[PDB]
C-alpha cells in the first residue's frame, strides 16, 4: 500500500539446524520472462503474506531499536540480525509482502518486495545503500557481503520462512528452469513456497544467500534461483 514504509519483522536467526527436512530435485520446469528480472507462468496472480509483529505502541517514535534486553541504553546501533520478514508497514497499516536477511553489518533483500522501497525498524527509516533491479535484489550497509557462496554439487539448504509462521530448514537438491532465452540454475521443487528473501545456507552450516527469483510453477511447484554474496563492504572488498 504505502510502498515507502517497510518494517523488519524477525522470523528466525540465520543458522541452519531447524528441522533438516529432505526434498528437492524436480522436472526442469518452463517459466515465462517478464520485466527482464522477474518471471511468471504466462499470466500469474499474486497475494500478500501478512505479518503481525511490530506493535503500534510508539511504532514510529524515531528509533526504539529491535535488539533490547533492557530499555534503549543510548547504544543507537543494536541490531537483532537474522532471518527477517519484510512487511510493508504503514504507520496505520500492516501487510507482509516479502523477506530479507540482515547479518554481520549488511542487510541483503529483494527489489520486488514492493518497489525496492525504504525499510523501517521502530520508525528508523532504513533506506537502501544499493539496489540492483536487473537481478532484482537490494543491499543496505553497503553492497551484499558476508562471504557465503553455495558450492554447486551438494544439496542447497533453505530456511524456508513459512508465511507468518516458524522457519523450515529444508534440504533441497538443485534444479533448473527454462525461459525463452534458455535454462537457468535454481531450486526447482514441487512444495509450499517460503517468503522471497529466505536465507540460503550450504550443508556445512555456512553460507547466507537469498531465495527468491521465480514463481509458483506448474500449479504451485515453487521454482526460485539460488542467490549468494557477490558484492563487497561498499568500496572496500568482501574482507580482503
Amino acid at each position: 500500500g504505502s510502498a515507502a514504509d517497510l518494517e523488519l519483522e524477525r522470523a528466525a536467526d540465520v543458522k541452519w539446524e531447524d528441522q533438516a527436512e529432505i526434498s528437492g530435485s524436480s522436472p526442469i520446469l518452463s517459466i515465462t520472462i517478464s520485466e527482464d528480472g522477474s518471471m511468471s507462468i504466462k499470466n500469474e496472480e499474486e497475494e500478500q503474506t501478512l505479518g503481525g509483529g511490530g506493535s503500534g505502541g510508539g511504532g514510529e517514535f524515531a528509533g526504539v531499536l529491535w535488539d533490547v534486553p533492557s530499555p534503549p541504553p543510548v547504544g543507537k546501533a543494536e541490531l537483532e540480525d537474522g532471518a527477517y520478514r519484510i512487511k510493508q508497514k504503514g504507520i496505520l497499516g500492516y501487510s507482509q509482502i516479502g523477506a530479507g536477511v540482515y547479518k554481520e553489518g549488511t542487510f541483503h533483500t529483494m527489489w520486488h518486495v514492493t518497489r525496492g522501497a525504504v525499510l523501517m525498524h521502530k520508525g528508523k527509516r532504513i533506506e537502501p545503500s544499493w539496489a540492483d533491479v536487473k537481478k532484482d535484489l537490494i543491499s543496505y550497509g553497503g553492497g551484499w557481503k558476508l562471504e557465503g557462496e553455495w558450492k554447486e554439487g551438494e544439496e542447497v539448504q533453505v530456511l524456508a520462512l513459512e508465511p507468518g509462521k516458524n522457519p523450515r530448514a529444508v534440504q533441497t537438491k538443485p534444479g533448473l528452469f527454462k525461459t525463452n532465452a534458455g535454462t537457468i540454475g535454481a531450486v526447482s521443487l514441487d512444495f509450499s513456497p517460503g517468503t522471497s528473501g529466505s536465507p540460503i545456507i550450504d550443508k556445512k552450516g555456512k553460507v547466507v544467500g537469498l531465495y527468491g527469483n521465480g514463481v509458483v510453477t506448474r500449479s504451485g511447484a515453487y521454482v526460485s534461483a539460488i542467490a549468494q554474496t557477490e558484492k563487497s563492504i561498499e568500496d572496500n572488498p568482501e574482507i580482503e
Partner: peptide, 4 residues
C-alpha cells in the same frame, strides 16, 4: 499465490 505467487509468494515471490
Amino acid at each position: 499465490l505467487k509468494r515471490x
